[PDB]
């Protein structure tokens, strides 16, 4: 835990900790009626608000602002779902209070989402949870997930990579040192990053279905996910 790193994380957990999501909004997961229609309206609201929170959080990441303006957008579009899946997964596993996990689960399970997609998404939640990830880990991955250079329609992969590389290292250290019990923890964590990617096809297809069954998202969501 070098001083270069031991404070850098505190900046990051400082960001990750900022209670961006409005209680007034999340509360609707609990208080509103439960139906296919209402469930879907509720989830869009959370997701669109979350997209705002991610863009806020993403800014506060180190050396993000020094990035290419055109470049910056491609990371957000690509990493938006994976980031969203991380927090949503974080909720169920960690049973966050603002999460309303049980009731959030009910909504999701009756949002007009197919079983093909519902089964795996919920497998992922279970498995990632059994990992017993710390808050440190969650926030750190989210950062790693956002900066992944492999993301499509990018040019300056190296510039992001430098921004990313420090973070991978801090985790590499943290999991092994905090968890010498096993050294495969880094392997497990990064393994999931692959697992997340599986949902980008899943999610593109979920949007397609919703669309065709006359659901409509927000101007913000449509933009980030490239919805006609």
């Amino acid at each position: 835990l070098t001083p270069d790193q031991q404070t850098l994380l505190h900046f990051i957990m400082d960001s990750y900790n900022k209670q961006r999501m409005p209680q007034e909004i999340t509360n609707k997961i609990l208080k509103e009626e439960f139906s296919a229609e209402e469930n879907f309206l509720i989830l869009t609201e959370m997701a669109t608000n979350h997209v705002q929170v991610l863009v806020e959080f993403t800014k506060k990441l180190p050396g993000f602002q020094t990035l290419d303006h055109e470049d910056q957008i491609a990371l957000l579009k690509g990493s938006a779902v994976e980031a969203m899946f991380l927090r949503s997964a974080e909720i169920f596993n960690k049973k966050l209070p603002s999460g309303h996990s049980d009731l959030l689960e009910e909504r999701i399970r009756n949002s007009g989402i197919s079983d093909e997609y519902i089964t795996p998404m919920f497998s992922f939640y279970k498995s990632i949870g059994e990992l017993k990830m710390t808050q440190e880990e969650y926030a750190l991955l989210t950062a790693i997930v956002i900066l992944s250079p492999d993301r499509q329609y990018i040019k300056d992969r190296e510039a992001v990579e430098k921004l990313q590389e420090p973070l991978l290292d801090v985790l590499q250290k943290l999991c092994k040192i905090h968890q010498p019990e096993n050294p495969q923890h880094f392997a497990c964590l990064l393994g999931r990053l692959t697992e997340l990617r599986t949902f980008n096809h899943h999610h593109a297809e979920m949007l397609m279905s919703w669309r065709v069954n006359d659901h409509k998202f927000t101007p913000l969501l449509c933009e980030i996910w490239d919805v006609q």
Binding site: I73, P219, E223
Partner: peptide, 11 residues
């Protein structure tokens, strides 16, 4: 373009 995202960043 991607007008909304850009505004979000600068905002």
């Amino acid at each position: 373009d991607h007008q909304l995202l850009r505004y979000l960043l600068d905002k």
